[PDB]
Amino acid sequence: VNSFSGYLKLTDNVYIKNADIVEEAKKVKPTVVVNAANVYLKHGGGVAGALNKATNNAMQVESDDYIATNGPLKVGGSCVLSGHNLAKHCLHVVGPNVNKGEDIQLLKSAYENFNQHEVLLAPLLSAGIFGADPIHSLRVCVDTVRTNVYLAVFDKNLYDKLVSSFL
Ligand SMILES: O=C(O)COc1cccc2ccccc12
């Protein structure tokens, strides 16, 4: 048993809810919250900015020190940092950004990072301002992630569309 509530079960291991991932993280305090990061860990908008804002910029301070030491991530890659006041850990995962011209085939590599964690709270990688088709991102998630993933979909209209089209 775990603490996630009101999710719709899609498969053996994938669950989904219409929820603000920030509000969800604050309530559940999951072991792992996934950030939809970029390779620079510059948390400007979307899930990265919202999460970072909820940490009072501590996520961005930590991230700047990580980049100063290690250099940028790879598209498709990840790193584990603090979850601050939101979670034990934050898994910063870089999905391809279609609005920057990155290869959508890297989305499967991005979701493979989730398999290193038994349970995660996550957004739909490469959806929203990342420019990929969220229906596609949900299908890659289901077909790639084998660990237990709780997907928060911010937009109510998108949530309804994802559920109604899910095979
Ligand atoms: O939750 C959703 O309605 C769809 O996902 C997203 C919405 C807006 C911004 C996003 C940025 C990164 C990844 C997903 C995002």
UniProtKB/Swiss-Prot annotation:
Inhibited in vitro by GRL-0617. It is a multi-pass membrane protein. It catalyses: Thiol-dependent hydrolysis of ester, thioester, amide, peptide and isopeptide bonds formed by the C-terminal Gly of ubiquitin (a 76-residue protein attached to proteins as an intracellular targeting signal). It is found in: Host endoplasmic reticulum membrane. Residues 1-167 form the Macro domain. Changing S164L: In strain: Gamma/P.1. Changing T31A: In strain: Mu/B.1.621. Responsible for the cleavages located at the N-terminus of the replicase polyprotein. Participates together with nsp4 in the assembly of virally-induced cytoplasmic double-membrane vesicles necessary for viral replication. Antagonizes innate immune induction of type I interferon by blocking the phosphorylation, dimerization and subsequent nuclear translocation of host IRF3. Also prevents host NF-kappa-B signaling. In addition, PL-PRO possesses a deubiquitinating/deISGylating activity and processes both 'Lys-48'- and 'Lys-63'-linked polyubiquitin chains from cellular substrates. May form homohexamers. Interacts with N protein. This is Papain-like protease nsp3. It comes from Severe acute respiratory syndrome coronavirus 2 (2019-nCoV). The lineage of its organism: Viruses, Riboviria, Orthornavirae, Pisuviricota, Pisoniviricetes. The chain holds residues 1025 to 1191 of 7096 of the full protein.
